[PDB]
Ligand binder design. Structure first.
Ligand SMILES: O=C(O[C@@H]1Cc2c(O)cc(O)cc2O[C@@H]1c1cc(O)c(O)c(O)c1)c1cc(O)c(O)c(O)c1
Ligand SMILES: [Ca+2]
Ligand SMILES: [Ca+2]
Length: 72
């Protein structure tokens, strides 16, 4: 489970299937897969824009918040 930065950190590295400290786009579409996210490929980028509004090519814990910001 992931609540505040206290657990967010662990919940973050736990989602990165590649296991490299960060999460790429090819892993995002699979990160929500465990939930059953069945959408076209044009909708995936719709989630990254929030996880990485800077579009630097990588999502870091610091940006992981802009995606969760306390959601449920
Ligand atoms: O991106 C989705 O989950 C994100 C990852 C995630 C998680 O792994 C564990 C957890 O405790 C909370 C959590 O919130 C995330 C999230 C990100 C968003 O941008 C968002 O709008 C949202 O409602 C939530 C998502 C997609 C969905 O299609 C969906 O229906 C949903 O309810 C959620
Ligand atoms: Ca990664
Ligand atoms: Ca970024």
């Amino acid at each position: 489970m992931g609540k505040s930065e206290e657990e967010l950190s662990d919940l973050f590295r736990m989602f990165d299937k590649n296991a490299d400290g960060y999460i790429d786009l090819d892993e995002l579409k699979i990160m929500l897969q465990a939930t059953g996210e069945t959408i076209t490929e044009d909708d995936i980028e719709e989630l990254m824009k929030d996880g990485d509004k800077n579009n630097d090519g990588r999502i870091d814990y610091d940006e992981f918040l802009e995606f969760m910001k306390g959601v449920e």
